[PDB]
Design a binder for this molecule. Structure first.
Ligand SMILES: NC(=O)N[C@@H](C(=O)O)c1ccc(O)cc1
Ligand SMILES: NC(=O)N[C@@H](C(=O)O)c1ccc(O)cc1
Lengths: 300, 300
């Protein structure tokens, strides 16, 4: 009822020449191993169907569009939904969304154990830069290839659980966590592509892991929420991406952690009633919060 | 100019029978050792002039009032201001404020190196409970003995530095940090009386340190602010108070930490320009924040 097993399916590199068909096989295998370890839900990474294309400057718009989905699911990704419904396991999938009216989003969905899309979220905090910067060995052009999401920070019923979505950079922003905490989220999940080199601030490179885990622990604790972060990790097209995919308790304790830079599955026992230990005491919102003093946070 | 040395003056226990006169001696000694180690400012704890009286139920209102200050400074505390002006060192002092119009506040002030009170703050987030609870070996009746502060989260010029104040429980609330981060605080400082036993949630007792330090590191990182937390610590009137008084860099790295449960002074080199490493890149607020999605945080 209130007890489930949450899984994270960390992805090793996806090369530029690796088809969605070859990625779906890798996702199917991880989704199968999570079932066999008793998982009811598995979190997959940000932009989980392709290489991280925002590392390149594009001149050809057909080449750029080829990394986006025009439908969800499409025939190549459909087998992942079919297998999820067969095994009775929900998932969180990140992908690049192209909607033609041409709007571009960094998107994620929640799929329940029936294989039904129960909710969508579009990345609101876009990191990196807008224009090509030649000094960078690799680019991070999310501000060019995506518009900021227009759906807000919703929380959806997924089987037994109140679940909210972040995408990568969102996890560093207390406002993203707090909104979803105020909407009663019991699990906050998403994925990331996080380089271990930041060209403008290389003096925080050795803190990549620290800053990632610090963000997940603080968000979980301050909102008494279970959380899970699914990385795409390792040497991808000669850029190193941070590992340390994780599941976190509402106390902010890390209860599971990846140790490889490859396809790796981790699981943890989730008790949704454990949110109360914070939300009815230390972080009893109605009882403690003084929102008349917080107005500057919501000012445009 | 943009470089200073920040000190923290951690306090061991203050017994019920220990006069303000005997505490000022202890504060003078710590303030002298900080000067000798090149400190330009020292952070002192919450309610630094008395035992932590909110651990007891009071029936007599004269007995309760005796723990509050009706003026700041008074003659007994005046020597601490005089010594601060002589040595050229500012301080942050917490005390119980009684103002008659009768209003009761958990208060802290910033004093610059001239010995002039440059800013006041009143604790906005009150923890614990309102009525006596007999099962508790000790009470935490801040909701009875204080009203929520009415000054907001201001940020003040103190010599070369933009400084904001929290008081104890405030440090667990992202909203307190964020408001002061948005007002351009370079240092966020205050003190705490944090029991290592929480009677309603004893299953988080072993996490007292973790939760304290997690709050300071995450606040600092997410706002690119220097921070400092001054504890009153050790066995005070048979209640154990958490140590681990700390200074933290804008990266959320702990740059100094106490290891005793006694009067202890720690210092760190503060470079106020280091805020830019976060505030001009990863946490470039104007460039990244989407406050149209954050409205629920400011709803009453
Ligand atoms: N994919 C993302 O949203 N990645 C960002 C993040 O994880 O917050 C990130 C972090 C460090 C960088 O050098 C670039 C981008
Ligand atoms: N002075 C304070 O505000 N103390 C509170 C805090 O530090 O958050 C606190 C923390 C844990 C408890 O079990 C009781 C009270």
């Amino acid at each position: 009822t209130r007890q489930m097993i949450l899984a994270v399916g960390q992805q090793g590199p996806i090369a530029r020449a690796e088809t969605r068909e070859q990625v779906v096989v890798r996702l199917l295998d991880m989704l199968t191993k999570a079932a066999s370890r008793g998982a009811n839900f598995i979190v997959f990474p940000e932009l989980a169907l392709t290489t991280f294309f925002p590392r390149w400057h594009f001149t050809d718009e057909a080449e750029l569009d080829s990394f986006y989905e025009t439908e969800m699911p499409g025939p190549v990704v459909r087998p992942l939904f079919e297998k999820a419904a067969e095994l009775g396991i929900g998932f969180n999938l990140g992908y690049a969304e192209l909607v033609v009216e041409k709007r571009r989003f960094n998107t994620s969905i929640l799929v329940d154990k029936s294989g039904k899309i129960v909710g969508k979220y579009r990345k609101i905090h876009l990191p990196g830069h807008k224009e090509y910067e030649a000094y960078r060995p690799f680019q991070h052009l999310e501000k060019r290839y995506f518009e900021p999401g227009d759906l807000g920070f919703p929380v959806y019923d997924v089987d037994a659980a109140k679940m909210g979505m972040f995408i990568a950079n969102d996890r560093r922003w207390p406002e993203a966590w707090r909104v979803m905490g105020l909407r009663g989220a019991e699990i906050i999940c998403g994925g990331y592509n996080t380089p271990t080199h930041n060209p403008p601030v290389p003096q925080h490179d050795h803190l990549t892991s620290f800053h990632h885990l610090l963000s997940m622990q603080a968000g979980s604790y301050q909102n008494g929420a279970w959380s899970a972060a699914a990385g795409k990790v390792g040497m991808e097209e000669n850029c190193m991406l941070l590992g340390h995919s994780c599941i976190v308790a509402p106390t902010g304790e890390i209860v599971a952690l990846t140790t490889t830079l490859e396809d790796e599955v981790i699981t943890a026992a989730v008790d949704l009633d454990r949110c109360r230990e914070l939300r009815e005491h230390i972080f009893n919102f109605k009882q403690h919060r003084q929102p008349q003093h917080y107005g500057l946070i919501a000012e445009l």
